[PDB]
Design a protein around this ligand. Structure first.
Ligand SMILES: Nc1ncnc2c1ncn2[C@@H]1O[C@H](COP(=O)(O)OP(=O)(O)OP(=O)(O)O)[C@@H](O)[C@H]1O
Ligand SMILES: Nc1ncnc2c1ncn2[C@@H]1O[C@H](COP(=O)(O)OP(=O)(O)OP(=O)(O)O)[C@@H](O)[C@H]1O
Ligand SMILES: [Mg+2]
Ligand SMILES: [Mg+2]
Length: 326
């Protein structure tokens, strides 16, 4: 009946990255970029002959929500930060606003770059994704993120209504206590699976939103003593089965075939499918790999030898998954 709970908890200990509130180093790297933006902006706007825009920053992403993992060797940390500029959205092209930040981050690190949803700045061993918002007061009450690239057409340049506070609050409030800890462990486990079996360029946000909809705690409460034990292997099995169950074969007219697609809405504005950017072929590979992980989660629960159980898990979770010698 070989259990694997101790092995999962040790795996968790190895992969987890402390969130911003417990990570001096992350805060320091964060604050450095925010400082370089403030400093940078003074020059960019001295040129324009205009007073510098101010901004309010906030923590975003997994280091804000305590779902962060350590990258594998060669991999990069992803420091996500929002900045709310004291500007009215209706008065500015969003890409143009993003240009102020890239130019402010001209010299800092290996430079800065304007992505579709953020300005990203590169440094040795990490990047910082700055999501750029217009001021809700000056912009008629909504918080809108700057969407669009430099090369992007007109209909793809926009201020999209967002709700990062709402999203973070739903992730943190879904469960509590040791139930919530298991939720977070299972997101992390799957982000290492991602880093191990997917190429370095199943989104993090995808699995997070997915767990919000479909994660269920797996624990046993002894009827007599009320003593609780968690079963992380079982929690992943049910969660992964539930995701697989929600793939829909979706016809693509252009390719004249169907691909299995997992759709997962953000539980807050704008309720976009967080996986919409994955192509049909990437979704098909995502599904096969999910099925193979499910198969190993089941194999792991029916091995006499702890070695054989752990090995089956290590083939999917990678070489930081502990495999005790036979
Ligand atoms: N496709 C999307 N739709 C809506 N919001 C998103 C999307 N992608 C990212 N975000 C927002 O930006 C944040 C940072 O995105 P990122 O891709 O870094 O995910 P993350 O949660 O930090 O996970 P990871 O640990 O993989 O970095 C998310 O946590 C989410 O609030
Ligand atoms: N809705 C969102 N809210 C906040 N951040 C987001 C959102 N969507 C994406 N991001 C951020 O930007 C990063 C990548 O998303 P983006 O859509 O900008 O990629 P892209 O510019 O299309 O690049 P690629 O060429 O790789 O497709 C994520 O890691 C995340 O931090
Ligand atoms: Mg992130
Ligand atoms: Mg990011």
């Amino acid at each position: 009946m070989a259990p694997v709970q101790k092995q999962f908890r040790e795996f968790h200990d190895r992969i987890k990255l402390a969130q911003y509130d417990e990570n001096q180093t992350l805060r320091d790297e964060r604050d450095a970029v925010l400082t370089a933006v403030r400093e940078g902006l003074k020059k960019v706007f001295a040129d324009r002959g205009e007073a510098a825009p101010t901004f309010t920053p906030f923590n975003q992403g997994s280091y804000a929500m305590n779902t962060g993992v350590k990258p594998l060797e060669g991999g990069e940390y992803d420091i996500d930060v929002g900045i709310i500029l004291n500007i009215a959205k209706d008065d500015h092209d969003p890409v143009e606003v993003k240009k102020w930040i890239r130019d402010a981050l001209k010299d800092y690190g290996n430079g800065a770059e304007i992505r579709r949803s953020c300005v990203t700045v590169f440094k040795p061993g990490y990047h910082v994704d700055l999501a750029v918002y217009a001021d809700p007061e000056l912009s008629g009450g909504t918080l809108c993120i700057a969407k669009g690239k430099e090369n992007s057409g007109d209909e793809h340049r926009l201020w999209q209504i967002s709700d990062p506070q709402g999203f973070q609050d739903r992730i943190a409030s879904k469960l509590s206590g040791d139930d919530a800890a298991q939720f977070r462990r299972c997101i992390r486990y799957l982000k290492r699976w991602r880093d191990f079996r997917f190429s370095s360029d199943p989104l993090g946000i995808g699995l997070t939103a997915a767990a919000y909809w479909w994660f269920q705690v797996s624990k046993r409460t002894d009827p007599v003593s009320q003593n609780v034990t968690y079963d992380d292997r079982d929690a992943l099995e049910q969660f992964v089965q539930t995701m697989l169950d929600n793939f829909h074969d979706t016809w693509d007219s252009k390719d004249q075939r169907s691909y299995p697609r997992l759709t997962v809405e953000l539980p807050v504005q704008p309720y976009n499918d967080v996986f919409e950017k994955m192509t049909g072929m990437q979704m098909e590979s995502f599904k096969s790999k999910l099925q193979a992980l499910l198969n190993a989660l089941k194999t792991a629960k029916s091995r006499l030898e702890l070695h054989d159980a752990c090995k089956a898990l290590a083939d999917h979770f990678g070489s930081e998954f502990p495999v005790p010698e036979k």
